[PDB]
Amino acid sequence: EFYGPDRALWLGPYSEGAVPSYLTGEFPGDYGWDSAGLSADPETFAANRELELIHARWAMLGTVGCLTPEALEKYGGVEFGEAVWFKAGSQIFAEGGLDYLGNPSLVHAQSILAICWTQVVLMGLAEGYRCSGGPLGEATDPLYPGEAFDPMGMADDPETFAELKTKEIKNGRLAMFAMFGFFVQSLQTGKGPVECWAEHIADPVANNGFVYATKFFGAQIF
Amino acid sequence: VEFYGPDRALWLGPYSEGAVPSYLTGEFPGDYGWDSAGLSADPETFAANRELELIHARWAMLGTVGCLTPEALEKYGGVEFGEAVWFKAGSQIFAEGGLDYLGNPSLVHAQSILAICWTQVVLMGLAEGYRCSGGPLGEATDPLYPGEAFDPMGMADDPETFAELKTKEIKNGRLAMFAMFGFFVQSLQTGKGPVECWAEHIADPVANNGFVYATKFFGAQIF
Amino acid sequence: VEFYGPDRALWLGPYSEGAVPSYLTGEFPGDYGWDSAGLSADPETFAANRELELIHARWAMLGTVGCLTPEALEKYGGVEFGEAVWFKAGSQIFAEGGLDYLGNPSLVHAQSILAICWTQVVLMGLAEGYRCSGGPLGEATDPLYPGEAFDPMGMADDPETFAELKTKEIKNGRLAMFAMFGFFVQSLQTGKGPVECWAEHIADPVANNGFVYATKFFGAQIF
Numbered sequence A: 001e002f003y004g005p006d007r008a009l010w011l012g013p014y015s016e017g018a019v020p021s022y023l024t025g026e027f028p029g030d031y032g033w034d035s036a037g038l039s040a041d042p043e044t045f046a047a048n049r050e051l052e053l054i055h056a057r058w059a060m061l062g063t064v065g066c067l068t069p070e071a072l073e074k075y076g077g078v079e080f081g082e083a084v085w086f087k088a089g090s091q092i093f094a095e096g097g098l099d100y101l102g103n104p105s106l107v108h109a110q111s112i113l114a115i116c117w118t119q120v121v122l123m124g125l126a127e128g129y130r131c132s133g134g135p136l137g138e139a140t141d142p143l144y145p146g147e148a149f150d151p152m153g154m155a156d157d158p159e160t161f162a163e164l165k166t167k168e169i170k171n172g173r174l175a176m177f178a179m180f181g182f183f184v185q186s187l188q189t190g191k192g193p194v195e196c197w198a199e200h201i202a203d204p205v206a207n208n209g210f211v212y213a214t215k216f217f218g219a220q221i222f
Numbered sequence B, C: 001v002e003f004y005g006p007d008r009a010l011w012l013g014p015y016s017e018g019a020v021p022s023y024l025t026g027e028f029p030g031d032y033g034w035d036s037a038g039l040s041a042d043p044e045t046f047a048a049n050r051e052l053e054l055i056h057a058r059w060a061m062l063g064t065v066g067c068l069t070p071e072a073l074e075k076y077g078g079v080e081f082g083e084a085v086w087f088k089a090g091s092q093i094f095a096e097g098g099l100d101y102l103g104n105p106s107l108v109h110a111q112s113i114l115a116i117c118w119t120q121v122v123l124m125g126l127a128e129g130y131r132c133s134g135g136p137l138g139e140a141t142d143p144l145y146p147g148e149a150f151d152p153m154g155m156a157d158d159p160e161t162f163a164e165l166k167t168k169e170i171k172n173g174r175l176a177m178f179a180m181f182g183f184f185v186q187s188l189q190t191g192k193g194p195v196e197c198w199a200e201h202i203a204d205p206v207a208n209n210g211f212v213y214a215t216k217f218f219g220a221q222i223f
């Protein structure tokens, strides 16, 4: 019910008139949603599927990456320089630098210029290998190469492969949706996601988003 | 006719001849031959953008009247709202007394934004669902012009005047969208309501115009 | 030899083939095979985007020289402008005496912002009309390369050097657009002019670089 003509659509029963002809159920995540007609061209639709999933993979890492140090500081008694994700980058400018987990023996980076231009070379080469191949194999598929990147062979079965593609893109869209939550939540409340959540569950009727509705993405206008 | 077909009005007047794409043929309402960014070269995308544009235009038409009415009512009709300016109207739900319609505490008198929010989700969620796939008030025969229960006075029964009404609708809407964009930037830049801006301007148009606030970037006084 | 056709230079160097869309074949200037978002898969849109890009590149090329000239002239040529920094240059029309060209009160000496604005509307309005459909300086034979009155020195008469000049034009223009993007973000972040940023940087590059302002979001010091 996630592929083919009898798949799930993005409006449930009210989908009978809101699914374009080119969204036929072939690709993962096809809920028949393209109201803006941005993927009518088959080549562009291929590009947007590549844009979407690559984003979804970064968001999946992002939600765990943003929540982990804040959850470790608030519930694991760990002492980071800055454990909140939107302030975490700034701990490179403090005295002592960026000590991993607060431990000065771990990483302990002192120069943002080294962090920056090391990432440029590594990610520059790594992304170059993604489009045209490199040390860890040939780029047989822009999203699912599954050579060195499927060591446990979880994509070997063609039938479960089709279902795993669905699980990947649905969890990824949830992660992207959450990362967008982090962004506006941080501008609006000024606090980290863990702290936002904790404050909310304590008094959900009083600790929700509408408390900050008088600000425009942080800015207190009017 | 001068709003359809090959001799219709174009978006550059006489300087148009060389700035009209081949796929803008004069078929749909509002076709002034303007798609310089080639965003509607695909016929299917063009179909979506016409639906986006008109659906926007209908919200803008309601918006301009919706934004101006309580402010015009307060400034010239002596009505006492909690917040009569559109961009401050939402905040009245957090004020004491809540959202009193027309200022009357016996009208609406809403106290909970959470109730306003999740009521609109259900009502608009179904209403938009009925728009794409039909529902209680008929079948969604056309994404923009169903005209069943939504043409009760049958003004679209004549094919010729129907074509002229479609033109009037999309032109008034683009004017409304263009005006709502005015509301947005005027509020960020001046901080006042549209009615007050209009009144202040005609008082001294040479001194009360936009360039007084050009040193601010959409409200922010940078540099 | 290496900027057109199948053996041209691409936007990822050796890692490029397999990251070049089928519709980027080497025919047009600047074709490094970069359209990862597939925004130009449609031939007609791709035609529009090439016009958007090049017209921007020409405005950016004029922009970089226009933004750097008064700031470099004021700080290194002993010239006294009213406001020599580009993002402050527009505001000098609101000061007393107005916009004196090069600071000399006998040059221009504009006093009305409304006069500058609505003269530009008429002049640029007609000029852009002449660009799409032709006019006094000839017919619009080509949307980007008319080369009638706009190639008086006939530098594009040789077909081979024309092909190379087209390449140089788009590469210098993309650098200018990329640089203008630098001006925009640099001014929001640092609050200083491009020349002064350059001068401050070369004095102590390890301490006078962008990361000093990384805690601000395009000017705003949030968090």
Ligand code: CHL
Binding pocket: B009, B010, B011, B012, B013, B014, B015, B032, B174, C117, C120, C121, C125, C126, C129
């Ligand atoms: C003959 C001259 C003629 C000209 C030049 C135009 C030109 C235009 N028309 Mg047409 N029309 C003309 C005749 C006619 N029009 C129409 C019917 C229409 C219609 C329905 C519409 C147009 C629209 C437009 C605009 C669309 C292009 C654009 O956005 O450029 C503008 C781009 C620019 C770069 C101009 C800006 C210059 C300005 C000085 C910038 C200001 C500087 C700021 C202060 C600095 C900013 C700072 C930063 C930080 C923000 C454009 C101004 C459309 C419109 O209104 O969209 C806006 C539209 O919807 N025209 C008819 C009836 C048949 C005509 C009769 O001859």
Ligand SMILES: CC1=C[C@H](O)CC(C)(C)[C@H]1/C=C/C(C)=C/C=C/C(C)=C/C=C/C=C(C)/C=C/C=C(\CO)C(=O)CC1=C(C)C[C@@H](O)CC1(C)C
Binding pocket: A033, A034, A035, A036, A037, A038, A055, A056, A058, A059, A061, A062, A063, A064, A065, A066, A084, A085, A086, A088, A089, A176, A177, A179, A180
């Ligand atoms: C479908 C559709 C149909 C219509 O027809 C048209 C349409 C409506 C337009 C269209 C709809 C489309 C929609 C809904 C679009 C939505 C897009 C969204 C929300 C994208 C979100 C993506 C967000 C990402 C990648 C976040 C990555 C996080 C990282 C990096 O991995 C870090 O956190 C890294 C990190 C960590 C982990 C810790 C910190 O310390 C430091 C930093 C660097 C911040």
Ligand SMILES: CC1=C[C@H](O)CC(C)(C)[C@H]1/C=C/C(C)=C/C=C/C(C)=C/C=C/C=C(C)/C=C/C=C(\CO)C(=O)CC1=C(C)C[C@@H](O)CC1(C)C
Binding pocket: A012, A184, A188, A208, A209, A210, A212, A213, A214, A215, A216, A217, A218, B117, B121, B125
């Ligand atoms: C039916 C069904 C069956 C399946 O079997 C399972 C299923 C699929 C799950 C299920 C489907 C269910 C469906 C359709 C769910 C639909 C949910 C919707 C639309 C809910 C809408 C929520 C809207 C909200 C909270 C508004 C937030 C605004 C705030 C507060 O924070 C601002 O302050 C706004 C604001 C302001 C004022 C200023 C800005 O600066 C910042 C921001 C935050 C933007």
Ligand SMILES: CC1=C[C@H](O)CC(C)(C)[C@H]1/C=C/C(C)=C/C=C/C(C)=C/C=C/C=C(C)/C=C/C=C(\CO)C(=O)CC1=C(C)C[C@@H](O)CC1(C)C
Binding pocket: B034, B035, B036, B037, B038, B039, B056, B057, B059, B060, B062, B063, B064, B066, B067, B085, B086, B087, B089, B090, B177, B178, B180, B181
């Ligand atoms: C043509 C073209 C060709 C090229 O090739 C490419 C191109 C250049 C891109 C392209 C050009 C495209 C152009 C010009 C795009 C312009 C877009 C614009 C301005 C759209 C504006 C739309 C805005 C809307 C719907 C307003 C809604 C208002 C409401 C809702 O009713 C309320 O006020 C509701 C409301 C609220 C919520 C607050 C409360 O207090 C009460 C009230 C006031 C009623």
Ligand SMILES: CC1=C[C@H](O)CC(C)(C)[C@H]1/C=C/C(C)=C/C=C/C(C)=C/C=C/C=C(C)/C=C/C=C(\CO)C(=O)CC1=C(C)C[C@@H](O)CC1(C)C
Binding pocket: A116, A120, A124, C013, C185, C189, C209, C210, C211, C213, C214, C215, C216, C217, C218, C219
């Ligand atoms: C290989 C090769 C071969 C050919 O033969 C010749 C060749 C082609 C030349 C050559 C090609 C080379 C290649 C591939 C070059 C690659 C270069 C790259 C990727 C450069 C990386 C740069 C990254 C930087 C500095 C980050 C800057 C951001 C800052 C700090 O200044 C902020 O403040 C961040 C910031 C924040 C945090 C808050 C916001 O508000 C504002 C901003 C500014 C965004």
Ligand SMILES: [Mg+2]
Binding pocket: B018, B019, B036, C132, C143
């Ligand atoms: Mg044109």
Ligand SMILES: [Mg+2]
Binding pocket: C141, C142, C143
């Ligand atoms: Mg030609």
